[PDB]
Design a protein around this ligand. Structure first.
Ligand code: NAP
Lengths: 1210, 48, 93
């Protein structure tokens, strides 16, 4: 029997797919049925070997539900099991999550020289507050300057400059220093003026702190106490650092710069010095994902380490805490020299008069080429921060340089000092054009050792195109002194007789005729010769991913070559516009820069877009991973319900209600459900209400943006949520205020229930209602009067005041005998016994309706209906107040209970983003129908078990018409019947996608079959020849590419009309993760997959839906499963992650949703004119968590493109 | 010809521990004084 | 039926009922003389249309009791269609 149970797990998880990421043990069985006679007969007869069948009914992951059937050789069922609920031994925490999803997060190839983001400019409030405090002082600033510096010397010398170490001078000098600001006619009144200013936002954290320090600096004026501990140990100091838009935007630009650096450089051993409270640490680590292998939280004092540990617990594994005094040698303090790729100075360099020596220490800790992020003062302005900054205890240390404190070094003098201490200058800086950013302007500096060069022969292939000619001339003019070889085309290279083996190739052939468009003319053999003579290589393409898919095929070929020939350093540069120089030479020089111990990432691939360089990084797309895992555990994401659909879904166990993401993800069918209106719900009924045999529908009140009007409406919704998409017929569009906020929805709900009860029953002449809602009674009486039915009201609290547990004899005595139907609306279920006793005394055959027959938590019209509902409601509106029972959705979810349905309860859906931005339990991408029933979905090349599984999943998700196509579809008609039982018509086209004529014949046969137009295509034809390119042969390239490349070309040309009457909802092209990382011996496959990716991207740029999925090893179904290669691929488990059958379905669904979202955003004027705009279309998948312990076995771990997917080790 | 039985398999992992529930449910027996199950579903056409 | 007819079986899995039972059903009528099919009916309620009307054998047939003229005309008209289904003395005691 336990083996029979294991059958359920086997169905759920294939061997080696790792779908069973957590240990499930049985915790509930709906029913086990066993025939003891047959079991005993089998046991005694010796035929122990018996057959079994099992259905893994539920497989989302939270708990498996299996239906098992064990039968003898004669198919006599020995026993069966129904809904054997396997549940995890312990709750499935995030440690069991599947991180297969990934995206091409693009970022600058180098940090931007100027961090000038308008979002982080000083707002009007702050840009007026700072000049306002200047107004107090700006009059005589020229005279003030020196005195202000003197006051800033409170720590070291001001207590002696006027004998200010004594009480009289201390008291005089505190107010004299404050008047240095307040002297110009404001003086003491400035004390109240400061509070007046603080009353408004952007004024409080800074000038309030000024006021606080000005009233307690007397002991510090004589150098007798801590400068800031006097301020309650903090009053606003952290707020001033963070909230103020003078100290804030510096931190924002620091986050942006650190994000760029950790994007281009990943697995960085980061070390922040002077973190203290960690505000800068908070901001920098606030990046969604960054490639920090480790993060050394460091400060001069360890007192803040407990706060850092509590605040940065999520990054505790990445984070290590170690104090450091930059004024002291790091080696003496236990740190390993040159072991950090990045160091951060959180406003600490000003706290050391040894600035040069401290920066030298930072260089010593930094690896060659490491980035030093310096959050530090610069470009002082006396009228803005002087007297408040001057107070600190060690910040003034540094006046030895001759300027106030450690000088507010300018970016030029910063560059000078920084170069003098062993760095590559200030190549990046924060904007400080006007004000408010000088106090904390940030800079990034590289550790100068083995620096970027900016000897082996340089070989250029290509130059035929006029732009290619121009670029060849530019290479010649800009190349340093090096041996040079030039060839017009790759055929000329084939004709070459002397090619250096240490060649550094620069290939412009893609700018000319592409390789994968002319491989017939021995171009494949020429590429083999190139690889033979190529030790270093650089490739150039012109908007390959958006204009030239053949150039992208070449890029993928190089991607695989970098795996086949690791000694061959390869770079590829895709340019949106070639006419927009000087960067190919630097990349060629880099190719020879094979630095292993240096932080410089080898830049495997690059894209020049919008006049700037960009590099991609495969960062876990936590949105899609969260959506996938929500199927398995309660994934919570902060979603704005007011602007995103969030349904208060009921739990599977029906124990409590929770907020669930209701995003339908752009289902295009809205014609059969004509003019499906979008309702922004303000108030709604938690429980679904039954209607006149139509079904259960929740009652929702909200607004509809009719030409931007917030028109109030009340409708019956199948997906009660903040936002709903409902048919117009189920909507009452009147804006009557009598249907007031909350109360109106209450009354409409009650009247819907009453109308349903009256309508379904009426045939009867008199009925009885048990424990109806308090509001309901009068409404039910009104409905009975309006339908001429004698309705009797019974309550367990005119009404018949019954009581639970009443004797049946009492019911006979009191209950009328003319009742023909009973309606039990009791929210409390204890009245079930009372109802049962009623059934024994009422008229035999009396119709019985329970609360579950009118109200339910799960859902899964004549225009006069709502007119009658509102007419009845207008009779009984005065029965209660508007807010009789109003609670927010959050409160309902936290406290409401399904078993106790509090009828006449209404949910106040939040409308403001602050009120509506809530942690919503994410919904699985495939938890709702995603496909239309009036379109055909063409699974090209998908006829194996993978294709069959995808098709059955599709029909399960609204695909009523599916077409499987292949050169030889070996599909069982019994499987077709099975899928038809699911509700979808599935057919096999036997279409050879390799030929245009075959594709046209199949698409005409579609009409011969009368099937609807093709609304979507799943392109996954596959042929594999696992051999390295040098040993590969052109026929293998043709066999691998023609299916893939020719099929995508044919299908695109067939559906290359975005203005056509039947635009494709999606065009999913099944790519392998080799298309993103390569694989030894699959250069042709990688090139074909990259062609698919580029064609999908340019199709999206053309206004046509499309997407690509970079699938890993699909152990569940398909090539790996049918070829029986589970052991071989699990041997490279660390290289390619598993993509389960149902995980593959989830990935396909996510790709379809991404394509639809991209198309809709294009309708929202999203250009999609470059690679950067299409990071989502390439749903990178199949990269496992890269363990450094297996770095040796992993043949692509050194690739920085996967840096963010590398597990930390230290 | 029926028998409904409420069963509970109580467990205790140690002599010092209290007796706790390990399993529970109901048993509905069709009995005699001394084809009952649906025939097994036709085997799924495609199976890896 | 638990023995055109849909040859169901008592103790059938709810998943099987979903597979076979039509989803357009709005009402269920259980006339099973044998009450063992109550579990099958309950499983039907979980797969049929939510809110589907449920009628049991006790709602049509009972041992305790405690009209339009066209009613019997319609009854006999229907009976005259299916008289040949069985013999006269199919079950007489
Ligand atoms: N390593 C990975 O990352 C990986 C693993 C699995 C799947 N995938 C992707 O998922 C999709 C499906 O792969 P799969 O699991 O189903 O592999 P598969 O089991 O080997 O099935 C692929 C089949 O497509 C057939 N085919 C159909 N029309 C064809 C044509 N016109 N020319 C050539 N072959 C044609 C091939 O020959 P037959 O017609 O005779 O069947 C082939 O057997 C593919 O696009 C693939 O890229 C990737």
């Amino acid at each position: 029997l336990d083996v029979a149970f294991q059958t359920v797990i086997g169905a759920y998880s294939s061997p080696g797919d790792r779908r069973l990421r957590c240990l499930y043990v049985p915790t509930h069985v709906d029913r086990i049925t066993l025939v003891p006679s047959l079991c005993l007969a089998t046991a005694e007869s010796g035929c122990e070997k018996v057959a079994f069948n099992t259905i893994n009914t539920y497989d989302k992951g939270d708990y498996l539900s299996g239906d098992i059937v064990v039968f003898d050789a004669e198919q006599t069922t020995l026993f069966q099991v129904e809904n054997i609920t396997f549940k995890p031994f312990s709750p499935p925490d995030a440690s069991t999550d599947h991180a297969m999803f990934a995206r091409w997060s693009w970022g600058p190839l180098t940090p931007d020289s100027l961090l000038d983001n308008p979002e982080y400019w000083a707002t009007a409030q702050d840009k007026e507050a700072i000049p306002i405090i200047e107004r107090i002082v700006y009059f005589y600033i020229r005279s003030f300057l020196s005195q202000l510096t003197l006051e800033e010397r409170q720590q070291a010398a001001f207590h002696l400059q006027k004998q200010i170490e004594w009480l009289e001078q201390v008291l005089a000098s505190a107010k004299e220093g404050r008047h240095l600001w307040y002297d110009p006619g404001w003086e003491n009144d400035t004390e109240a003026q400061i509070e007046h200013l603080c009353t408004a936002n952007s004024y409080h954290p800074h000038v309030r702190l000024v006021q606080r320090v000005g009233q307690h600096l007397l002991p510090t004026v004589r150098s007798n106490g801590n400068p800031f501990d006097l301020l309650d140990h903090d009053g606003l100091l952290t707020e001033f650092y963070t909230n103020t838009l003078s100290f804030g935007p510096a931190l924002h630009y620091a986050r942006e710069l650190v994000a760029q650096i950790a994007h281009r450089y990943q697995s960085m051993d980061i070390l922040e010095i002077g973190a203290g409270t960690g505000g800068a640490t908070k901001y920098v680590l606030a990046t969604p994902q960054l490639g920090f292998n480790s993060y050394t939280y460091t400060d001069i004092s360890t007192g803040f380490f407990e706060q850092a540990r509590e605040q940065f617990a999520p990054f505790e594994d990445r984070m290590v805490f170690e104090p450091l005094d930059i004024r002291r040698s790091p080696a003496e303090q236990g740190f390993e020299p040159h072991a950090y790729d990045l160091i951060i100075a959180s406003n600490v360099l000003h706290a050391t008069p040894d600035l040069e020596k401290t920066m030298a220490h930072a260089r010593s800790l930094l690896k060659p080429g490491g980035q030093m992020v310096i959050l530090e003062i610069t470009h002082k302005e006396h009228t803005r921060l002087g007297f408040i900054f001057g107070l600190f205890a060690d910040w003034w240390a540094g006046v030895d340089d001759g300027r106030c404190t450690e000088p507010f070094v300018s970016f030029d003098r910063w560059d000078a000092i920084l170069k003098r201490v062993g760095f590559s200058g200030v190549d990046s800086r924060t904007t400080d054009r006007d004000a408010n950013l000088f106090p904390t302007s940030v800079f990034s500096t590289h550790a100068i050792d083995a620096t970027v060069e900016y000897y082996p022969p340089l070989v250029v292939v290509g130059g035929q195109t006029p732009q290619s000619q121009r670029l060849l001339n530019d290479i010649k003019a800009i190349m340093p002194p090096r041996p040079l070889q030039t060839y017009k085309r790759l055929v000329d290279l084939l004709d070459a007789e002397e090619l250096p083996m240490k060649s550094t190739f620069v290939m412009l052939t893609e700018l000319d005729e592409e390789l994968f468009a002319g491989l017939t003319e021995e171009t494949f053999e020429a590429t083999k010769l190139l690889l033979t003579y190529a030790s270093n290589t650089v490739w150039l393409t012109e908007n390959a991913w958006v204009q030239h898919p053949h150039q992208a095929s070449t890029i993928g070929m190089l991607r695989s070559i970098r795996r086949e020939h690791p000694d061959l350093g390869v770079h590829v540069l895709d340019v949106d516009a070639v006419e927009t120089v000087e960067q190919v030479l630097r990349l060629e020089e880099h190719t020879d820069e094979l630095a292993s111990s240096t932080t410089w990432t080898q830049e495997p691939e690059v894209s020049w877009c919008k006049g700037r360089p960009w590099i991609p990084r495969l960062k876990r797309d936590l949105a899609r991973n969260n959506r996938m895992n929500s199927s398995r555990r309660p994934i919570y994401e902060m979603i704005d319900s007011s602007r995103a659909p969030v349904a208060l879904q009921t739990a599977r166990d029906s124990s409590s209600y929770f907020l669930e993401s209701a995003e339908t993800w752009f289902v295009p069918e809205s014609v059969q459900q004509m003019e499906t209106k979008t309702i922004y719900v303000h108030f709604s009924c938690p429980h679904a209400l039954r209607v006149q045999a139509l079904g259960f529908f929740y009652l929702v009140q909200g607004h509809v943006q009719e030409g931007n009007r917030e028109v109030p409406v009340v409708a019956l919704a199948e997906r009660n949520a903040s936002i709903v998409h409902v048919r117009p017929d189920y909507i009452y569009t009147e804006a009557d205020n009598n249907l007031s906020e909350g109360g109106g929805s209450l009354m409409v709900t009650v009247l819907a229930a009453a109308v349903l009860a009256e309508t379904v029953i009426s045939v009867t002449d008199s009925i009885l209602v048990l424990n109806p809602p308090s509001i309901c009674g009068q409404m039910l009486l009104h409905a009975g009067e309006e339908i001429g039915l004698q309705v009797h009201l019974a309550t367990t609290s005119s009404w018949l005041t019954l009581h639970a547990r009443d004797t049946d004899w009492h019911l006979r005595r009191v209950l009328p005998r003319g009742v023909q139907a009973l309606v039990d609306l009791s929210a409390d279920q204890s009245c079930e016994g009372l109802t049962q006793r009623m059934m024994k005394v009422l008229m035999p055959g009396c119709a019985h309706y329970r609360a579950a027959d009118l109200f339910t938590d799960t859902v899964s019209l004549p225009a006069a209906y709502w007119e009658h509902v509102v007419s009845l409601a207008r009779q009984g509106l005065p029965s209660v107040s508007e807010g009789w029972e109003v609670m927010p959705c959050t409160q309902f979810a936290a406290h409401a209970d399904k078993t106790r349905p509090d009828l006449s309860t209404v949910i106040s859906w939040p409308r403001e983003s602050d009120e509506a931005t809530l942690p919503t339990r994410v919904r699985s991408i495939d938890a709702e129908t995603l496909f239309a029933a009036d379109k055909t979905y063409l699974l090209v090349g998908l006829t194996g078990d993978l294709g069959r599984s995808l098709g059955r999943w599709m029909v399960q998700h609204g695909a009523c018409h599916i077409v499987l196509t292949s050169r030889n579809p070996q599909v069982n008609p019994k499987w077709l019947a099975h899928v038809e039982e699911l509700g979808g018509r599935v057919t096999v086209l036997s279409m050879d996608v390799t030929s245009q004529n075959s594709v046209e014949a199949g698409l005409a046969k579609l009409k011969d079959l009368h099937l609807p137009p093709v609304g979507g295509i799943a392109f996954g034809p596959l042929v594999l020849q696992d051999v390295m390119l040098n040993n590969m042969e052109l026929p293998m390239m043709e066999m691998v590419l023609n299916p893939k490349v020719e099929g995508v070309r044919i299908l695109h040309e067939k559906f290359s009309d975005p203005t056509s009457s039947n635009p494709l909802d999606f065009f999913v092209m099944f790519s392998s993760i080799v298309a993103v990382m390569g694989n030894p011996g699959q250069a042709n496959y990688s090139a074909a997959n990259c062609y698919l990716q580029a064609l999908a991207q340019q199709r999206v740029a053309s206004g046509l839906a499309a997407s690509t999925i970079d699938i890993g090893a699909v152990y569940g179904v398909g090539f790996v499963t049918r070829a029986e290669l589970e052991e071989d691929f699990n041997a490279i488990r660390f290289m390619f992650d598993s993509v389960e059958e149902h995980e593959l379905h989830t990935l396909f669904a996510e790709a379809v949703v991404a394509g639809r979202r991209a198309v809709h955003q294009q309708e929202q004027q999203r250009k999609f004119a470059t690679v950067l705009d299409m990071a989502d279309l390439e749903l990178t998948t199949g990269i496992p968590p890269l363990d450094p312990a297996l770095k040796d076995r992993i043949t692509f771990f050194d690739d920085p493109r996967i840096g963010n997917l590398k597990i930390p080790e230290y | 010809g029926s028998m409904t039985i409420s069963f509970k398999i109580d467990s205790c992992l140690s002599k010092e521990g209290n007796l706790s529930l390990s399993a529970k449910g109901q048993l509905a027996l069709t009995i005699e004084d001394v084809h009952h199950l649906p025939p097994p579903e036709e085997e799924h056409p495609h199976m890896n």
